[PDB]
Amino acid sequence: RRAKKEMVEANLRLVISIAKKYTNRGLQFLDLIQEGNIGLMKAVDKFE
DNA sequence: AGTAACCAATAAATGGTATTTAAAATGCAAATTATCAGGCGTACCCTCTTTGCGAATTCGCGGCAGCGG
């Protein structure tokens, strides 16, 4: 657990970029960001 | 080119009380097809950056605030 936190906290900027590419008047910025963070947690789980 | 209402008679005058008839039709609940609605996955590399620009030169008033003897 304490290992995965490090990658998750490292790649938040990546999430920000991908999200802002979709922000143009959808839900709201922060909702997109948080949903992307869910996705990032999934990806960290699946990466080899 | 013929009177009767005499007293029986005849069943026809009804519109009313029902267990039937089974055929129909009318509904009823299954089988059995189509199609819709969810979940998962994607391996070159990409890393705070977008915003609101201002419910828009109001104004007058009040009061709850920080500095200050």
Swiss-Prot record:
A motif (Interaction with polymerase core subunit RpoC) lies at residues 31-34. It is found in: Cytoplasm. It comes from the Bacteria. Contains 4 domains, connected by flexible linkers. In the active conformation, the domains are in an extended conformation, each making extensive interactions with the RNA polymerase catalytic core. Belongs to the sigma-70 factor family. RpoD/SigA subfamily. Interacts transiently with the RNA polymerase catalytic core formed by RpoA, RpoB, RpoC and RpoZ (2 alpha, 1 beta, 1 beta' and 1 omega subunit) to form the RNA polymerase holoenzyme that can initiate transcription. Identified in a complex containing RpoD, the RNA polymerase subunits RpoA, RpoB and RpoZ, CRP and DNA. Interacts with Rsd; this prevents interaction with the RNA polymerase catalytic core and with promoter DNA, and as a consequence, promotes transcription from promoters that require alternative sigma factors. Sigma factors are initiation factors that promote the attachment of RNA polymerase to specific initiation sites and are then released. This sigma factor is the primary sigma factor during exponential growth. Preferentially transcribes genes associated with fast growth, such as ribosomal operons, other protein-synthesis related genes, rRNA- and tRNA-encoding genes and prfB. This is RNA polymerase sigma factor RpoD. It comes from Escherichia coli (strain K12).
